[PDB]
């Protein structure tokens, strides 16, 4: 229990569960995260839950209909190291001169995929938080509140 090195300013899960420490840490972190996430959903208004239902429906469809494409894009990305700001900037440039619903649902599905592949909890939630802002531009919220 000496000092702690501060946080910065392969995607096979089993490469992170070799030791008993890894297993128990995985259990503790999942406990904390599941507890928070259940408690969050429990408090979400009826309105937010309906937006979740909508996004569940559309993006689950994209995930299954374009599974091959999600994997392809993941490979295109992980061919070289890239930051969260890189993918965010890219997504931003597209949504600027592309006001369709599809590209936004596709982006949510893709970023979600990167989330599943990422093994760094902090960088993952950073990505989710940052990209969710970028995806939910005025064009997107208009699509969602009209389908609701």
């Amino acid at each position: 229990h000496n000092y702690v090195y501060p946080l910065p300013e392969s995607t096979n899960i089993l490469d992170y569960l070799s030791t008993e420490r890894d297993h128990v840490m995985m259990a503790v972190q999942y406990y904390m995260s599941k507890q928070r996430l259940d408690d969050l959903y429990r408090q979400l208004p009826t309105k937010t839950r309906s937006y979740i239902d909508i996004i569940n429906m559309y993006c689950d469809k994209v995930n299954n209909d374009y599974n091959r494409d999600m994997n392809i894009m993941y490979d295109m990305a992980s061919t070289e190291s890239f930051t969260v700001y890189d993918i965010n900037n890219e997504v931003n440039t597209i949504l600027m001169d592309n006001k369709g619903l599809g590209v936004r649902l596709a982006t949510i599905s893709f970023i979600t995929e990167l989330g599943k592949r990422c093994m760094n909890p902090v960088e993952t939630i950073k990505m989710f938080t940052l990209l969710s802002h970028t995806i939910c531009d005025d064009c997107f919220i208009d699509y969602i509140t009209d389908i609701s």
């Binding site: 494409d69 392809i72 990305a77 993918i87 890219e90 997504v91 619903l101 599809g102 590209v103 596709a106």
Partner: peptide
């Protein structure tokens, strides 16, 4: 931006197909 540009065009291509099928 080369590798990221590809991912970008791919998202738009998926998106265009989505806009064509679903709505």
């Amino acid at each position: 931006s080369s590798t990221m540009g590809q991912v970008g065009r791919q998202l738009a291509i998926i998106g265009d197909d989505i806009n064509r099928r679903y709505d």
